[PDB]
Design a protein around this ligand. Structure first.
Ligand SMILES: Nc1ncnc2c1ncn2[C@@H]1O[C@H](COP(=O)(O)OP(=O)(O)O)[C@@H](O)[C@H]1O
Length: 794
């Protein structure tokens, strides 16, 4: 008991792990120095836990028994008030025990300092429900004022003191908009009452209520002073205040002077971020369902160490989970390097790790399912072809059709064998591929292409050193997307470059409702065009009708696009966190005070036109960043297209239609391929069924005709077009260099802020509004004039 109390009073507030280790060592050292004959293992066993849930007394418990009890209680909790599944690991057990300990005291006030999204609020809600404490959380909005806060304080105090109901009052660093909020908290936490809160008639009514309360307890109180004293005692008894903060320096010392009652009346619990331990246990527990079993795994000699207690035989599953925690950890080094050289780094909350693991699981399940269907179709096709070949050989011992089909079916068999051999390697490397894919989807949405590539390279190097099999020399934007949806996106006016394709990939496979950083309106229109069928609605936080449209979009299931997110309304805080209640057969979600029946089809997108905006970490944990930056290659391609449209319009129009037709030929070739395979697998006629042989030779004729046409157009027409365009490419290079010099100009001077539209106007003026070009018809002189005038006008 002595050691348990020493740990709860000397190590909860510690920040670094070194200090925690020092405290844990010196507890044992002191106990051994004073007690020289005690048995260490019966008193100093490492998982010192104490709880009174299992029994009627505050006895020690065991991790496994407590884990089972907590699991059962969470199962009841979900059906009771909050259907958000959790993962249980050692830290969650310790923290729920600490929070219950504080909740049991009369004036039990808590201060949970830890990264956003780490589970502080939901753990407090869980344990408060366990102990029967009604939870109260103020609903902050755009017009939330100090008077609104005082009204909530009056209500919570009236319910605590009068009517004698226990309350857990949960507050956040974001809820304290003004300093008057912190002054009222200071007095409430230090004295159990706010003098001057109740004034005029309110006070009288309060006194009336207080009198009633005494009549409930049988006390005979009549004076307005003793009634107030009794009310203060009741509030000291039935009211617990919980505070959550981010572990930021210069914010704790600020609060140590702004409201010192947070350091003398509140128990400080330093949650911090999930430790390497916690990441390891959540990784393994969530990925347990996934098939990460590799019997022929080879352990490398110099494996890298991330989790210290990694089993000395690392199985495949352990290696995968170790790589998962490595992927999460590398984002912190990336942010540190970014902040050291420049800045604009966001916060890597544990909700990022939850998204990464969930993406890994879903993607592994999906890609495993697709490979199996394709391989089964290929195998049955090969079996049917072998059957018909043997049948024809027997019949030879009428036949012209057989040779005609065999003419193409021979190469069909060859490439089928090739694909079967290749895709069996894909099955081997599915784990590493899906790991890298989900990691990129979850952790690179905000970074630019150089940073995304560096992250991918580091993850690949780690997977290589850990002997994990991932298919290299491939590009992610193909592994995560098919050509059909790529065509559908491009029909939605999506720019045609890798960054935009993968941004749309993120916008399709999203767990946390995305936040779009588009300095232009391209992503905004792209979203509008895609969700136009589903009747997406455009609303803004600045709009006063935002709440009306939000409620409508939630209760009817229509997608919603919101701009100007710098003015984020905390009304969305539940919706982003998906705090849903599956009660009465329906899903209910709470906005402010009103509860509404959510529809499963509801989708919300948030967006902003400012790329140089810093968001608070509470928002940074609830959204998926999708940053639509501009790349060198995309700018070069747009500039080359523009100069070809202007200088040689005929070639541009030719190139435009030719490229448009090339896309349709690959589409139709894939469709004929699918129809061929489906027809082979569905029918039960090798050579006897003419009704099935008339639909397959014509298919080969269409295939041959279309391949001939495309090899004709993509080689002859595209050659001359490419030769025409390869002379304007120095202009595009020198045109992107100046734009990126302009963008870099903001570093030396804050006033030098230039947008892409500005340089585009420069370039359009140089092309279509150039007086020095009036009269010149030769293309070489025109190009020289264009480049000189671009430099000068810029
Ligand atoms: N240990 C955990 N296991 C699973 N989900 C978690 C865990 N911790 C936090 N979450 C997720 O975080 C969301 C709410 O986080 P919250 O507790 O509000 O963050 P904070 O602790 O900063 O208040 C929930 O939707 C939940 O899914």
């Amino acid at each position: 008991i002595w050691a348990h109390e020493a740990l709860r009073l000397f190590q909860d507030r510690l920040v670094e792990d070194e200090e925690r280790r020092w405290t844990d060592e010196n507890i044992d050292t002191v106990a051994l120095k004073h007690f020289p004959n005690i048995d260490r293992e019966k008193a100093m066993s490492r998982p010192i836990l104490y709880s009174n849930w299992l029994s009627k007394d505050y006895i020690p418990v065991d991790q496994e028994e407590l884990r089972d009890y907590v699991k059962a209680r969470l199962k009841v909790f979900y059906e009771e008030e909050l259907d958000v599944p959790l993962v249980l690991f050692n830290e969650v057990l310790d923290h729920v025990l600490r929070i219950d300990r504080i909740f049991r005291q009369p004036q039990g006030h808590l201060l949970l300092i830890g990264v956003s999204g780490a589970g502080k609020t939901t753990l407090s809600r869980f344990v408060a429900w366990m102990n029967g404490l009604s939870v109260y959380q103020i609903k902050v909005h755009r017009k939330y004022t100090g008077e609104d806060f005082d009204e909530d304080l009056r209500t919570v105090l009236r319910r605590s003191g009068c009517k004698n109901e226990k309350i857990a009052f949960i507050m956040d660093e974001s809820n304290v908009l003004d300093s008057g909020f912190l002054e009222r908290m200071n007095t409430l936490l230090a004295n159990g009452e706010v003098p001057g809160l109740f004034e005029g008639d309110e006070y009288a009514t309060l006194m009336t209520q207080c009198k009633e309360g005494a009549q409930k307890e049988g006390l005979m109180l009549d004076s307005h002073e003793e009634l107030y004293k009794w009310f203060t005692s009741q509030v000291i008894r039935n009211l617990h205040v919980v505070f959550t903060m981010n572990p930021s320096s210069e914010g704790l010392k600020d609060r140590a002077a702004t409201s010192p009652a947070l350091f003398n009346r509140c128990v400080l619990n330093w949650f911090g971020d999930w430790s390497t331990e916690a990441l390891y246990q959540v990784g393994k527990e969530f990925t347990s369902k996934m098939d990460l079993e590799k019997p022929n795994y080879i352990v490398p000699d110099y494996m890298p160490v991330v989790y210290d207690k990694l089993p000395q035989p690392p199985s495949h599953r352990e290696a995968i989970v170790n790589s998962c925690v490595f992927v999460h950890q590398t984002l912190h080094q990336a942010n540190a390097r970014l902040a050291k050289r420049g800045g604009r780094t966001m916060a890597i909350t544990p909700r990022h790790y939850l998204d990464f693991i969930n993406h890994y699981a879903n993607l592994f399940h999906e890609k495993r399912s697709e490979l199996e269907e394709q391989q089964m179709h290929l195998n049955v096709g090969l079996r049917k072809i072998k059957e018909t070949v043997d049948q024809v050989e027997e019949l030879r011992r009428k036949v012209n059709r057989s040779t005609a089909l065999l003419k193409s079916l021979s190469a069909e068999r060859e490439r089928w064998e090739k694909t079967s051999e290749t895709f069996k390697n894909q099955m081997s490397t599915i784990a590493g591929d899906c790991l890298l894919s989900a990691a990129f989807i979850a952790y690179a949405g905000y970074f630019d292409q150089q940073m995304r590539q560096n992250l991918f390279t580091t993850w690949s190097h780690h997977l290589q050193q850990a002997n994990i099999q991932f298919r290299t020399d491939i590009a992610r934007t193909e592994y995560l997307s098919n050509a059909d949806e790529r065509l559908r996106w491009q029909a939605s006016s999506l720019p045609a470059d890798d960054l935009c394709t993968e941004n749309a990939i993120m916008l399709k496979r999203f767990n946390r409702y995305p936040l779009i950083i588009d300095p232009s309106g391209q992503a905004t229109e792209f979203i509008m065009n895609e969700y136009k069928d589903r009747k997406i609605t455009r609303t803004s936080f600045l709009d006063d009708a935002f709440r009306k449209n939000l409620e409508s979009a939630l209760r009817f299931g229509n997608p919603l696009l919101v701009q100007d997110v710098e003015s984020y309304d905390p009304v969305l805080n539940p919706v982003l966190n998906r705090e849903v209640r599956r009660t009465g057969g329906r899903v209910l979600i709470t906005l402010g005070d009103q509860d509404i029946d959510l529809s499963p089809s509801f989708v919300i997108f948030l967006s902003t036109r400012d790329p140089t905006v810093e968001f608070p970490p509470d928002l940074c944990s609830r959204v998926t960043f999708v940053n639509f930056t501009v790349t060198r290659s995309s700018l070069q391609s747009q500039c080359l297209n523009e100069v070809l449209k202007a200088e040689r319009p005929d070639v541009d129009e030719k190139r435009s239609d030719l490229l448009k037709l090339q896309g349709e030929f690959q589409l139709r070739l894939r469709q004929l391929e699918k129809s061929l395979l489906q027809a082979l697998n569905e029918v039960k006629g090798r050579i006897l069924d003419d009704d099935t042989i008339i639909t397959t030779l014509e298919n080969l004729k269409r295939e041959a005709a279309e391949v001939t046409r495309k090899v004709e157009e993509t080689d002859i027409v595209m050659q001359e077009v490419e030769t025409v365009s390869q002379q304007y490419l120095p202009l595009s290079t020198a045109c992107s260099s100046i734009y990126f010099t302009m963008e870099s100009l903001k570093q030396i001077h804050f006033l030098y802020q230039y947008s892409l539209q500005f340089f585009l106007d420069i370039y359009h003026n140089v092309l279509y509004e150039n007086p020095n070009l009036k009269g010149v018809t030769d293309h070489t002189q025109r190009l020289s004039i264009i480049t000189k005038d671009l430099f000068q006008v810029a």
